[PDB]
Short mmCIF file of C-alpha atoms and ligand atoms in Angstrom, two decimals:
data_model
loop_
_atom_site.label_atom_id
_atom_site.label_comp_id
_atom_site.label_asym_id
_atom_site.label_seq_id
_atom_site.Cartn_x
_atom_site.Cartn_y
_atom_site.Cartn_z
CA UNK A 10 0.00 0.00 0.00
CA UNK A 11 1.43 3.40 -1.00
CA UNK A 12 -0.33 5.40 1.75
CA UNK A 13 -0.31 4.72 5.50
CA UNK A 14 -1.52 6.89 8.38
CA UNK A 15 -0.25 6.69 11.96
CA UNK A 16 -1.66 8.64 14.91
CA UNK A 17 -0.15 9.02 18.39
CA UNK A 18 -1.54 10.43 21.64
CA UNK A 19 0.74 12.84 23.51
CA UNK A 20 -1.43 13.00 26.65
CA UNK A 21 -1.49 9.25 27.36
CA UNK A 22 1.76 8.25 25.62
CA UNK A 23 -0.05 5.70 23.49
CA UNK A 24 -1.17 5.02 19.94
CA UNK A 25 -4.37 6.87 19.09
CA UNK A 26 -6.76 3.93 18.67
CA UNK A 27 -10.06 3.86 16.76
CA UNK A 28 -9.55 7.32 15.24
CA UNK A 29 -11.57 7.93 12.09
CA UNK A 30 -9.48 8.96 9.08
CA UNK A 31 -10.91 10.16 5.76
CA UNK A 32 -8.84 10.61 2.61
CA UNK A 33 -10.01 12.86 -0.21
CA UNK A 34 -8.71 13.54 -3.72
CA UNK A 35 -9.06 16.95 -5.34
CA UNK A 36 -11.32 16.70 -8.37
CA UNK A 37 -11.05 18.72 -11.58
CA UNK A 38 -13.84 21.04 -10.39
CA UNK A 39 -11.73 21.91 -7.29
CA UNK A 40 -13.94 19.97 -4.85
CA UNK A 41 -12.83 17.22 -2.48
CA UNK A 42 -13.87 13.73 -3.60
CA UNK A 43 -14.02 10.88 -1.05
CA UNK A 44 -11.14 8.53 -1.80
CA UNK A 45 -10.65 6.16 1.15
CA UNK A 46 -11.25 5.97 4.88
CA UNK A 47 -10.95 3.79 7.95
CA UNK A 48 -10.18 3.70 11.65
CA UNK A 49 -6.75 3.41 13.24
CA UNK A 50 -5.87 0.03 14.73
CA UNK A 51 -4.64 -0.76 18.24
CA UNK A 52 -1.19 0.37 17.04
CA UNK A 53 -2.51 3.74 15.88
CA UNK A 54 -2.03 2.73 12.24
CA UNK A 55 -4.37 2.59 9.27
CA UNK A 56 -3.22 0.25 6.49
CA UNK A 57 -4.87 -0.77 3.24
CA UNK A 58 -6.33 2.62 2.36
CA UNK A 59 -5.50 2.33 -1.34
CA UNK A 60 -3.46 0.56 -4.01
CA UNK A 61 -0.65 1.59 -6.33
CA UNK A 62 -3.13 1.46 -9.23
CA UNK A 63 -5.59 3.87 -7.60
CA UNK A 64 -3.11 6.26 -5.93
CA UNK A 65 -2.33 8.38 -8.98
CA UNK A 66 -0.64 11.77 -8.86
CA UNK A 67 -2.83 14.55 -7.53
CA UNK A 68 -3.67 16.58 -4.46
CA UNK A 69 -4.93 14.60 -1.48
CA UNK A 70 -6.37 15.57 1.90
CA UNK A 71 -6.13 13.35 4.97
CA UNK A 72 -8.68 14.30 7.62
CA UNK A 73 -8.13 12.93 11.13
CA UNK A 74 -11.23 13.15 13.36
CA UNK A 75 -9.35 14.32 16.43
CA UNK A 76 -12.34 15.97 18.11
CA UNK A 77 -14.26 12.69 18.40
CA UNK A 78 -11.12 10.96 19.66
CA UNK A 79 -10.70 13.39 22.56
CA UNK A 80 -14.42 13.47 23.39
CA UNK A 81 -14.42 9.68 23.74
CA UNK A 82 -11.63 10.08 26.32
CA UNK A 83 -13.55 12.74 28.25
CA UNK A 84 -11.03 15.41 27.21
CA UNK A 85 -12.03 18.83 25.87
CA UNK A 86 -10.29 19.51 22.52
CA UNK A 87 -9.58 22.61 20.41
CA UNK A 88 -9.58 21.49 16.78
CA UNK A 89 -12.50 20.15 14.77
CA UNK A 90 -10.03 17.78 13.09
CA UNK A 91 -6.49 17.69 11.75
CA UNK A 92 -6.08 18.08 7.98
CA UNK A 93 -2.99 17.09 6.00
CA UNK A 94 -3.00 18.31 2.38
CA UNK A 95 -0.24 17.29 -0.02
CA UNK A 96 0.56 16.48 -3.63
CA UNK A 97 1.39 12.90 -4.57
CA UNK A 98 4.32 12.99 -6.98
CA UNK A 99 5.60 9.83 -9.03
CA UNK A 100 9.18 11.12 -9.22
CA UNK A 101 9.43 10.90 -5.46
CA UNK A 102 9.87 7.83 -3.29
CA UNK A 103 6.92 5.48 -3.52
CA UNK A 104 5.55 5.06 -0.08
CA UNK A 105 3.91 7.79 1.96
CA UNK A 106 3.42 7.71 5.70
CA UNK A 107 1.41 10.52 7.24
CA UNK A 108 2.11 10.63 10.94
CA UNK A 109 0.30 12.82 13.45
CA UNK A 110 0.97 13.47 17.13
CA UNK A 111 -2.11 14.74 18.97
CA UNK A 112 -2.64 16.93 22.01
CA UNK A 113 -5.91 18.63 22.97
CA UNK A 114 -4.81 22.11 21.78
CA UNK A 115 -1.96 21.13 19.45
CA UNK A 116 -0.91 18.63 16.83
CA UNK A 117 2.19 17.85 14.82
CA UNK A 118 2.22 16.07 11.48
CA UNK A 119 5.10 14.80 9.39
CA UNK A 120 5.49 12.97 6.09
CA UNK A 121 7.83 10.00 5.69
CA UNK A 122 8.31 9.29 1.99
CA UNK A 123 10.46 6.24 1.23
CA UNK A 124 11.32 3.92 -1.63
CA UNK B 10 -7.26 41.78 18.17
CA UNK B 11 -9.07 38.54 19.04
CA UNK B 12 -7.25 36.44 16.40
CA UNK B 13 -3.47 36.39 15.87
CA UNK B 14 -1.32 34.01 13.83
CA UNK B 15 2.38 33.37 14.49
CA UNK B 16 4.63 31.31 12.20
CA UNK B 17 8.20 30.14 12.82
CA UNK B 18 10.76 28.51 10.52
CA UNK B 19 12.34 25.38 12.04
CA UNK B 20 15.10 25.18 9.39
CA UNK B 21 16.46 28.70 9.86
CA UNK B 22 15.51 29.25 13.50
CA UNK B 23 13.74 32.46 12.58
CA UNK B 24 10.27 33.94 12.23
CA UNK B 25 8.58 32.86 9.01
CA UNK B 26 8.21 36.19 7.20
CA UNK B 27 5.74 37.04 4.42
CA UNK B 28 3.63 33.92 4.95
CA UNK B 29 0.17 34.33 3.43
CA UNK B 30 -2.72 33.41 5.73
CA UNK B 31 -6.36 33.00 4.70
CA UNK B 32 -9.16 32.71 7.26
CA UNK B 33 -12.53 31.19 6.38
CA UNK B 34 -15.75 30.78 8.34
CA UNK B 35 -18.29 28.04 7.74
CA UNK B 36 -21.53 29.49 6.38
CA UNK B 37 -25.12 28.41 6.97
CA UNK B 38 -24.96 26.39 3.74
CA UNK B 39 -21.87 24.61 5.15
CA UNK B 40 -19.41 26.15 2.67
CA UNK B 41 -16.23 27.99 3.62
CA UNK B 42 -16.81 31.70 3.31
CA UNK B 43 -13.80 34.06 3.10
CA UNK B 44 -13.40 35.90 6.39
CA UNK B 45 -10.01 37.65 6.49
CA UNK B 46 -6.48 37.35 5.14
CA UNK B 47 -3.03 38.85 5.51
CA UNK B 48 0.69 38.15 5.59
CA UNK B 49 3.06 37.62 8.50
CA UNK B 50 5.43 40.47 9.34
CA UNK B 51 9.17 40.48 10.06
CA UNK B 52 8.37 39.02 13.50
CA UNK B 53 6.41 36.15 11.95
CA UNK B 54 3.19 37.57 13.39
CA UNK B 55 -0.04 38.53 11.66
CA UNK B 56 -2.14 41.07 13.58
CA UNK B 57 -5.32 42.93 12.75
CA UNK B 58 -7.12 40.14 10.91
CA UNK B 59 -10.48 40.88 12.53
CA UNK B 60 -12.33 42.78 15.25
CA UNK B 61 -14.25 41.75 18.34
CA UNK B 62 -17.49 42.77 16.62
CA UNK B 63 -16.75 40.86 13.41
CA UNK B 64 -15.32 37.71 15.07
CA UNK B 65 -18.60 36.05 16.03
CA UNK B 66 -19.31 32.44 17.00
CA UNK B 67 -18.55 29.95 14.28
CA UNK B 68 -16.28 27.31 12.84
CA UNK B 69 -13.15 28.92 11.41
CA UNK B 70 -10.41 27.62 9.13
CA UNK B 71 -6.98 29.26 9.23
CA UNK B 72 -5.09 28.34 6.07
CA UNK B 73 -1.35 28.98 6.25
CA UNK B 74 0.20 28.97 2.78
CA UNK B 75 3.31 27.00 3.69
CA UNK B 76 3.96 25.77 0.14
CA UNK B 77 4.27 29.30 -1.26
CA UNK B 78 6.61 30.16 1.63
CA UNK B 79 9.04 27.30 1.02
CA UNK B 80 8.93 27.69 -2.77
CA UNK B 81 9.78 31.39 -2.46
CA UNK B 82 12.90 30.20 -0.60
CA UNK B 83 13.85 27.80 -3.40
CA UNK B 84 12.60 24.66 -1.62
CA UNK B 85 10.08 22.01 -2.68
CA UNK B 86 7.95 21.16 0.39
CA UNK B 87 5.53 18.32 1.06
CA UNK B 88 2.32 20.06 2.17
CA UNK B 89 0.11 22.37 0.14
CA UNK B 90 -0.64 24.40 3.28
CA UNK B 91 -1.39 24.00 6.97
CA UNK B 92 -5.08 24.08 7.93
CA UNK B 93 -6.24 24.87 11.47
CA UNK B 94 -9.98 24.31 11.96
CA UNK B 95 -11.71 25.16 15.23
CA UNK B 96 -14.92 26.42 16.78
CA UNK B 97 -14.48 29.90 18.23
CA UNK B 98 -16.32 32.05 20.77
CA UNK B 99 -19.05 29.52 21.58
CA UNK B 100 -18.73 30.28 25.31
CA UNK B 101 -18.29 33.99 24.67
CA UNK B 102 -15.47 36.08 23.22
CA UNK B 103 -11.94 34.73 23.57
CA UNK B 104 -8.54 35.71 22.23
CA UNK B 105 -6.90 33.10 20.00
CA UNK B 106 -3.28 32.82 18.97
CA UNK B 107 -2.72 30.22 16.26
CA UNK B 108 0.97 29.31 16.19
CA UNK B 109 2.70 27.13 13.60
CA UNK B 110 6.24 25.75 13.33
CA UNK B 111 7.26 24.87 9.77
CA UNK B 112 9.67 22.37 8.22
CA UNK B 113 9.67 21.24 4.58
CA UNK B 114 7.99 17.89 5.40
CA UNK B 115 6.38 18.67 8.76
CA UNK B 116 4.56 21.29 10.77
CA UNK B 117 3.26 21.72 14.28
CA UNK B 118 0.41 23.97 15.31
CA UNK B 119 -0.86 25.00 18.72
CA UNK B 120 -3.54 27.33 20.04
CA UNK B 121 -3.32 29.71 22.98
CA UNK B 122 -6.81 30.73 24.11
CA UNK B 123 -7.24 33.46 26.72
CA UNK B 124 -10.22 35.23 28.25
CA UNK B 125 -10.05 39.04 27.71
CA UNK C 10 18.08 40.26 27.19
CA UNK C 11 20.05 37.88 24.95
CA UNK C 12 18.36 34.71 26.29
CA UNK C 13 14.60 34.23 26.69
CA UNK C 14 12.59 31.07 27.38
CA UNK C 15 8.92 30.62 26.45
CA UNK C 16 6.81 27.62 27.50
CA UNK C 17 3.30 26.69 26.36
CA UNK C 18 0.86 24.05 27.62
CA UNK C 19 -0.58 21.90 24.80
CA UNK C 20 -3.30 20.36 27.03
CA UNK C 21 -4.84 23.62 28.23
CA UNK C 22 -3.96 25.84 25.26
CA UNK C 23 -2.34 28.35 27.58
CA UNK C 24 1.05 29.67 28.62
CA UNK C 25 2.83 27.32 31.00
CA UNK C 26 3.05 29.44 34.14
CA UNK C 27 5.51 29.05 37.03
CA UNK C 28 7.78 26.64 35.14
CA UNK C 29 11.22 26.47 36.73
CA UNK C 30 14.13 26.87 34.30
CA UNK C 31 17.80 26.22 35.07
CA UNK C 32 20.57 27.28 32.70
CA UNK C 33 24.03 25.70 32.82
CA UNK C 34 27.24 26.41 30.93
CA UNK C 35 29.92 23.83 30.23
CA UNK C 36 33.10 24.66 32.15
CA UNK C 37 36.74 24.16 31.17
CA UNK C 38 36.72 20.86 33.10
CA UNK C 39 33.71 19.78 30.99
CA UNK C 40 31.21 19.88 33.87
CA UNK C 41 27.92 21.78 33.84
CA UNK C 42 28.31 24.95 35.83
CA UNK C 43 25.19 26.79 37.07
CA UNK C 44 24.66 29.92 35.00
CA UNK C 45 21.18 31.34 35.68
CA UNK C 46 17.69 30.27 36.69
CA UNK C 47 14.17 31.59 37.01
CA UNK C 48 10.49 30.82 36.57
CA UNK C 49 8.10 31.58 33.72
CA UNK C 50 5.59 34.37 34.26
CA UNK C 51 1.84 34.52 33.57
CA UNK C 52 2.67 34.86 29.86
CA UNK C 53 4.79 31.70 29.94
CA UNK C 54 7.92 33.79 29.35
CA UNK C 55 11.12 34.01 31.37
CA UNK C 56 13.06 37.24 30.87
CA UNK C 57 16.16 38.67 32.50
CA UNK C 58 18.12 35.44 32.87
CA UNK C 59 21.41 37.02 31.82
CA UNK C 60 23.13 40.05 30.31
CA UNK C 61 25.06 40.66 27.11
CA UNK C 62 28.27 40.94 29.16
CA UNK C 63 27.66 37.73 31.10
CA UNK C 64 26.37 35.63 28.16
CA UNK C 65 29.72 34.77 26.58
CA UNK C 66 30.61 32.06 24.06
CA UNK C 67 30.01 28.55 25.32
CA UNK C 68 27.89 25.44 25.34
CA UNK C 69 24.70 26.04 27.31
CA UNK C 70 22.06 23.70 28.70
CA UNK C 71 18.55 25.03 29.33
CA UNK C 72 16.75 22.66 31.69
CA UNK C 73 12.97 23.12 31.77
CA UNK C 74 11.47 21.42 34.83
CA UNK C 75 8.45 19.94 33.07
CA UNK C 76 7.92 17.18 35.64
CA UNK C 77 7.45 19.64 38.51
CA UNK C 78 5.03 21.62 36.32
CA UNK C 79 2.75 18.68 35.51
CA UNK C 80 2.89 17.28 39.05
CA UNK C 81 1.85 20.66 40.47
CA UNK C 82 -1.22 20.31 38.23
CA UNK C 83 -2.02 16.84 39.60
CA UNK C 84 -0.64 14.94 36.58
CA UNK C 85 2.03 12.23 36.32
CA UNK C 86 4.17 13.01 33.24
CA UNK C 87 6.72 10.93 31.37
CA UNK C 88 9.82 13.14 31.22
CA UNK C 89 11.94 14.36 34.12
CA UNK C 90 12.54 17.65 32.28
CA UNK C 91 13.27 19.04 28.83
CA UNK C 92 16.93 19.74 28.07
CA UNK C 93 18.01 22.14 25.31
CA UNK C 94 21.76 22.06 24.66
CA UNK C 95 23.41 24.41 22.18
CA UNK C 96 26.53 26.40 21.42
CA UNK C 97 25.89 30.13 21.74
CA UNK C 98 27.59 33.30 20.50
CA UNK C 99 30.44 31.57 18.65
CA UNK C 100 30.03 33.95 15.69
CA UNK C 101 29.41 36.92 17.97
CA UNK C 102 26.51 37.96 20.18
CA UNK C 103 23.05 36.75 19.21
CA UNK C 104 19.61 36.82 20.80
CA UNK C 105 18.14 33.40 21.55
CA UNK C 106 14.55 32.49 22.30
CA UNK C 107 14.15 28.90 23.49
CA UNK C 108 10.52 27.88 23.08
CA UNK C 109 8.94 24.67 24.35
CA UNK C 110 5.48 23.14 23.91
CA UNK C 111 4.55 20.66 26.65
CA UNK C 112 2.29 17.61 26.84
CA UNK C 113 2.39 14.93 29.54
CA UNK C 114 4.23 12.42 27.29
CA UNK C 115 5.75 14.75 24.69
CA UNK C 116 7.41 18.09 24.14
CA UNK C 117 8.64 20.16 21.24
CA UNK C 118 11.37 22.77 21.40
CA UNK C 119 12.54 25.33 18.87
CA UNK C 120 15.08 28.13 18.81
CA UNK C 121 14.70 31.59 17.30
CA UNK C 122 18.12 33.19 16.81
CA UNK C 123 18.38 36.83 15.77
CA UNK C 124 21.24 39.26 15.27
CA UNK C 125 20.88 42.37 17.50
CA UNK D 10 13.19 -5.50 23.91
CA UNK D 11 11.60 -3.03 26.35
CA UNK D 12 13.22 0.10 24.85
CA UNK D 13 13.19 1.24 21.22
CA UNK D 14 14.25 4.55 19.68
CA UNK D 15 12.94 5.96 16.40
CA UNK D 16 14.21 9.12 14.70
CA UNK D 17 12.65 10.99 11.77
CA UNK D 18 13.93 13.81 9.56
CA UNK D 19 11.49 16.69 8.99
CA UNK D 20 13.62 18.39 6.30
CA UNK D 21 13.86 15.40 3.95
CA UNK D 22 10.69 13.54 4.98
CA UNK D 23 12.65 10.39 5.71
CA UNK D 24 13.85 8.21 8.56
CA UNK D 25 16.96 9.62 10.21
CA UNK D 26 19.50 6.95 9.26
CA UNK D 27 22.82 6.17 10.96
CA UNK D 28 22.16 8.51 13.89
CA UNK D 29 24.18 7.69 17.00
CA UNK D 30 22.09 7.10 20.12
CA UNK D 31 23.49 6.71 23.64
CA UNK D 32 21.44 5.54 26.61
CA UNK D 33 22.53 6.30 30.17
CA UNK D 34 21.24 5.21 33.57
CA UNK D 35 21.43 7.50 36.59
CA UNK D 36 23.74 5.99 39.19
CA UNK D 37 23.42 6.28 42.96
CA UNK D 38 26.06 9.03 43.01
CA UNK D 39 23.88 11.13 40.65
CA UNK D 40 26.15 10.65 37.61
CA UNK D 41 25.15 9.25 34.22
CA UNK D 42 26.39 5.70 33.62
CA UNK D 43 26.65 4.37 30.04
CA UNK D 44 23.90 1.78 29.59
CA UNK D 45 23.49 1.03 25.87
CA UNK D 46 24.05 2.61 22.48
CA UNK D 47 23.83 2.09 18.75
CA UNK D 48 23.02 3.68 15.41
CA UNK D 49 19.58 3.98 13.83
CA UNK D 50 18.86 1.63 10.93
CA UNK D 51 17.63 2.48 7.44
CA UNK D 52 14.14 2.76 8.98
CA UNK D 53 15.31 5.27 11.59
CA UNK D 54 14.92 2.68 14.34
CA UNK D 55 17.30 1.29 16.94
CA UNK D 56 16.31 -2.12 18.31
CA UNK D 57 18.05 -4.44 20.74
CA UNK D 58 19.34 -1.77 23.11
CA UNK D 59 18.58 -3.78 26.25
CA UNK D 60 16.67 -6.69 27.77
CA UNK D 61 13.83 -6.99 30.27
CA UNK D 62 16.35 -8.31 32.81
CA UNK D 63 18.67 -5.30 32.51
CA UNK D 64 16.05 -2.55 32.10
CA UNK D 65 15.20 -2.11 35.77
CA UNK D 66 13.34 0.86 37.22
CA UNK D 67 15.36 4.04 37.35
CA UNK D 68 16.06 7.30 35.57
CA UNK D 69 17.38 6.99 32.03
CA UNK D 70 18.73 9.48 29.50
CA UNK D 71 18.56 8.92 25.75
CA UNK D 72 21.03 11.12 23.87
CA UNK D 73 20.51 11.50 20.11
CA UNK D 74 23.56 12.88 18.28
CA UNK D 75 21.58 15.24 16.07
CA UNK D 76 24.47 17.63 15.38
CA UNK D 77 26.55 14.96 13.64
CA UNK D 78 23.48 13.85 11.68
CA UNK D 79 22.91 17.32 10.22
CA UNK D 80 26.61 17.96 9.57
CA UNK D 81 26.80 14.77 7.51
CA UNK D 82 23.96 16.17 5.37
CA UNK D 83 25.71 19.52 4.91
CA UNK D 84 23.07 21.27 7.04
CA UNK D 85 23.91 23.74 9.82
CA UNK D 86 22.18 22.70 13.09
CA UNK D 87 21.34 24.43 16.37
CA UNK D 88 21.45 21.77 19.08
CA UNK D 89 24.46 19.80 20.28
CA UNK D 90 22.14 16.80 20.64
CA UNK D 91 18.62 15.92 21.75
CA UNK D 92 18.24 14.51 25.26
CA UNK D 93 15.22 12.56 26.53
CA UNK D 94 15.21 11.96 30.30
CA UNK D 95 12.55 9.81 31.92
CA UNK D 96 11.83 7.38 34.74
CA UNK D 97 11.20 3.74 33.90
CA UNK D 98 8.30 2.55 36.05
CA UNK D 99 7.21 -1.26 36.39
CA UNK D 100 3.57 -0.38 37.11
CA UNK D 101 3.28 1.14 33.67
CA UNK D 102 2.97 -0.59 30.33
CA UNK D 103 6.04 -2.63 29.47
CA UNK D 104 7.38 -1.35 26.25
CA UNK D 105 8.86 2.10 25.72
CA UNK D 106 9.31 3.78 22.37
CA UNK D 107 11.16 7.08 22.33
CA UNK D 108 10.40 8.85 19.09
CA UNK D 109 12.07 12.05 17.91
CA UNK D 110 11.32 14.29 14.93
CA UNK D 111 14.31 16.42 13.92
CA UNK D 112 14.68 19.79 12.25
CA UNK D 113 17.85 21.91 12.22
CA UNK D 114 16.59 24.38 14.87
CA UNK D 115 13.82 22.29 16.45
CA UNK D 116 12.94 18.81 17.60
CA UNK D 117 9.90 17.04 18.99
CA UNK D 118 10.00 13.92 21.13
CA UNK D 119 7.22 11.68 22.36
CA UNK D 120 6.97 8.52 24.43
CA UNK D 121 4.79 5.58 23.39
CA UNK D 122 4.39 3.21 26.34
CA UNK D 123 2.41 0.06 25.58
CA UNK D 124 1.70 -3.36 27.02
O1 SBK E 1 6.70 30.66 20.03
C1 SBK E 1 5.60 31.34 20.23
O2 SBK E 1 5.64 32.51 20.58
C2 SBK E 1 4.27 30.69 20.03
O3 SBK E 1 4.36 29.63 19.03
C3 SBK E 1 5.13 28.57 19.33
N1 SBK E 1 5.39 28.28 20.59
C4 SBK E 1 6.16 27.23 20.88
CL1 SBK E 1 6.41 26.94 22.57
C5 SBK E 1 6.74 26.37 19.92
CL2 SBK E 1 7.77 25.00 20.37
C6 SBK E 1 6.48 26.68 18.57
C7 SBK E 1 5.65 27.80 18.27
CL3 SBK E 1 5.29 28.21 16.59
O1 SBK E 2 6.58 7.36 15.55
C1 SBK E 2 6.32 6.94 14.34
O2 SBK E 2 6.36 5.76 14.06
C2 SBK E 2 5.99 7.93 13.27
O3 SBK E 2 5.21 9.04 13.82
C3 SBK E 2 5.82 9.89 14.67
N1 SBK E 2 7.11 9.90 14.77
C4 SBK E 2 7.69 10.74 15.56
CL1 SBK E 2 9.39 10.66 15.48
C5 SBK E 2 7.05 11.66 16.40
CL2 SBK E 2 7.99 12.65 17.54
C6 SBK E 2 5.66 11.65 16.34
C7 SBK E 2 5.03 10.75 15.42
CL3 SBK E 2 3.29 10.71 15.26
NA1 NA E 3 -22.73 28.62 23.17
NA1 NA E 4 34.14 31.70 16.87
#
């Protein structure tokens, strides 16, 4: 799979488990088209979102439903969600990992692109 | 000044200067309506986006145009921009600072919320 | 004020107030010599640690006592403290802001370095 | 292994490869005793540092030689190294992952403690 998402919890020092993730692809009319989605596993990871065939070049948005995650833990959060927007490029290494570290009023995201 | 944006550059250890910022507010029809925009100063700070009267309850999106920043410095970054989406003022007026720390393949964002 | 420390709380979305900070400087015998200390104010900022005359070339360690901060708030955190170690002023005097963003099991730190 | 270290590079969007990592344990006389060390793999990870038998409760310091990493890439860095100092506690989950995300003038570190 060319696209993986990993989510960590900075308050509990744990993977962020059962977090909803939605992936969108920018369509020609400039709107966001549903592309793939799922929920992070017990390791905070979401595998199997797409295939090499389907993951063509383009602009993609990964939406991490952080607000629901914190609410389920009884913790009051700031953001509605975390959004990661990037261009997939065939020249570059082949595999994309979108990692996010979550706190109630902050998040960090990085991209690990490898061959 | 109930909304301020601050942007730092993690590669240079400096304020991120001349970063374009667009603010949107979700409308009744659930689309993103333009609300305010500006560019960060020499200190990396963007003041004067809105007023207490204008900055009503709602869901706001702060778009930080990180790609245009890195590309103006001769660098090809990963993200198109950084998007910070939050409900504001739903327990009354607050002051929000949206801070962001930028690297070519990563960014952090945090919010400081104070009661005037 | 060539050295300033700023600390934010990522759980509350607020400045991290009353955070103890200890600064050390590596001595000729390669031990850490106490250099300055203080506590962050209501803004999360610690000013007045040192002077331009006193803040000479060297390797400095800024210890931020994150554990005592979280424990004073009734929380059991992971780290003992956050340590920021850097060479300073080796191309002449600079102004350093050491910023840190704190969560119970995580912290970020960045440096803003400017030329007076 | 109860202790793993992972290092990522925020400038290149890649694992931080061949980074030296030194682990120390605080001794009774308040000095730092060498405990384990190694270099991150091609995945940015350092496995096999210690064993359950040796990793007793105590205060540990993980030192990541970030300055040498950046110099080898021709990039001018700020920090001498990144230090992560924490108490190992037997009540807690058993496995500790110390993760660090590196930029030239900034770094983030988080702890993932799982069972
Ligand atoms: O630095 C500021 O004044 C506010 O923004 C920030 N604050 C901290 Cl503590 C970090 Cl690590 C990064 C940023 Cl961008
Ligand atoms: O830890 C991973 O496996 C990848 O994701 C991450 N990696 C690092 Cl280094 C930090 Cl500090 C945070 C995250 Cl979310
Ligand atoms: Na309300
Ligand atoms: Na010199």
